[PDB]
Amino acid sequence: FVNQHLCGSHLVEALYLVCGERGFFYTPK
Amino acid sequence: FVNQHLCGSHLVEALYLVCGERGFFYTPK
Amino acid sequence: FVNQHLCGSHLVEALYLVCGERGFFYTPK
Amino acid sequence: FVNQHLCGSHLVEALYLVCGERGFFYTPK
Amino acid sequence: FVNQHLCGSHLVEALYLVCGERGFFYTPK
Amino acid sequence: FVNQHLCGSHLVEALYLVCGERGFFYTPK
Amino acid sequence: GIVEQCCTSICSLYQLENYCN
Amino acid sequence: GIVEQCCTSICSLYQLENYCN
Amino acid sequence: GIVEQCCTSICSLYQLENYCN
Amino acid sequence: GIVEQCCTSICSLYQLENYCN
Amino acid sequence: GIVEQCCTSICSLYQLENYCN
Amino acid sequence: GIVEQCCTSICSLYQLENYCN
Numbered sequence A, B, C, D, E, F: 001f002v003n004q005h006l007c008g009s010h011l012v013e014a015l016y017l018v019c020g021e022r023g024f025f026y027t028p029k
Numbered sequence G, H, I, J, K, L: 001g002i003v004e005q006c007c008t009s010i011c012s013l014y015q016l017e018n019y020c021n
């Protein structure tokens, strides 16, 4: 799904700004 | 230090494209 | 000065996520 | 609406590049 | 089409990261 | 050199908005 | 607002100028 | 995961905190 | 073009290489 | 201004919230 | 090149339009 | 770390793939 890929692209940058020093994990599957 | 914050903002997007369905763990310095 | 232009480009996106429905007024230097 | 949020994310960066020194205002509601 | 414009926005940055020194060409029409 | 890579990443997005349907040829240094 | 205008339809750069300060 | 949660519906920043390390 | 190819379906990085200079 | 303060020092969420409406 | 000119000096809309097709 | 290596030197696709799951 292309639109799912687009939202995940915005999810990653949102997580990076929110978490910061702690870091984050992204796992679609 | 802001320029590292900007560089990390581009790194996570690059990791998102490279990894895809695998996912990643972002751990900054 | 370009690096400020890049920093401002990241600032507006950060403001967009933080403010949400409130909105914001971006006034550069 | 998530897709509305995505377009607003691209609206902010488009406004920043177009306006420049004048600045801009974003107000969804 | 707005959603077509959004995908092209992500296509350009994906091409830039993939191609690198060679460069790339984007042509919707 | 990373800061040029970041600047080029913003340049292609700026070119994408400016050109629109015309398209562009990105040839880095 | 801009959401009902420039997201349902693609806005030109001139139409984007209406939302500068 | 986060894709089924924060993409079908808009997540608050507090909900985004659930995916930090 | 790339819009009809890599936007209707997700393209691999190898398929993205077809549009480099 | 936001540029003078946040492009020299990393602004957190609570600092950036000062500039919202 | 666009990099030598626009990554050292801020290019406006009309400068960036030079590199379109 | 990824920051110490890739924010000082340009990391390619194969270097960035090292940090995937």
Ligand SMILES: *C(=O)CCCCCCCCCCCCC
Residues within 6 Å of the ligand: A001, A003, A004, A007, A028, A029, D002, D003, H003, H004, H007, H008
């Ligand atoms: C892996 O494929 C995840 C399994 C669930 C897929 C959900 C697809 C839709 C996700 C929502 C995207 C919203 C885009 C605005």
Ligand SMILES: *C(=O)CCCCCCCCCCCCC
Residues within 6 Å of the ligand: D001, D003, D004, D007, D028, D029, E002, E003, G003, G004, G007, G008
């Ligand atoms: C606040 O919610 C604004 C009221 C109108 C909502 C419009 C929602 C749809 C906006 C268009 C989004 C287009 C995305 C490509």
Ligand SMILES: *C(=O)CCCCCCCCCCCCC
Residues within 6 Å of the ligand: A002, A003, E001, E003, E004, E007, E028, E029, I003, I004, I007, I008
């Ligand atoms: C110029 O208009 C190209 C002709 C074909 C238009 C295709 C429009 C749809 C493109 C897919 C967009 C997918 C967004 C997730």
Ligand SMILES: *CCCCCCCC[C@H](*)CCCCC(*)=O
Residues within 6 Å of the ligand: B001, B003, B004, B029
């Ligand atoms: C002087 C030019 C800008 C570079 C700043 C120095 C490099 C970053 C500091 C060292 C890295 C660790 C950051 C910790 O917070």
Ligand SMILES: *CCCCCCCC[C@H](*)CCCCC(*)=O
Residues within 6 Å of the ligand: C001, C003, C004, C029
């Ligand atoms: C020398 C490293 C890059 C920093 C450039 C100097 C800081 C920006 C100039 C002062 C800010 C006002 C910009 C006005 O146009």
Ligand SMILES: *CCCCCCCC[C@H](*)CCCCC(*)=O
Residues within 6 Å of the ligand: F001, F003, F004, F029
């Ligand atoms: C010292 C501050 C950062 C600027 C680095 C020097 C400018 C970029 C090098 C010259 C441009 C050509 C790059 C070739 O790979």
Ligand SMILES: [Cl-]
Residues within 6 Å of the ligand: A006, A007, D006, D007, E006, E007
């Ligand atoms: Cl999008």
Ligand SMILES: [Cl-]
Residues within 6 Å of the ligand: B006, B007, C006, C007, F006, F007
């Ligand atoms: Cl940057």
Ligand SMILES: [Zn+2]
Residues within 6 Å of the ligand: B006, B010, C006, C010, F006, F010
């Ligand atoms: Zn940047």
Ligand SMILES: [Zn+2]
Residues within 6 Å of the ligand: A006, A010, D006, D010, E006, E010
């Ligand atoms: Zn998007």
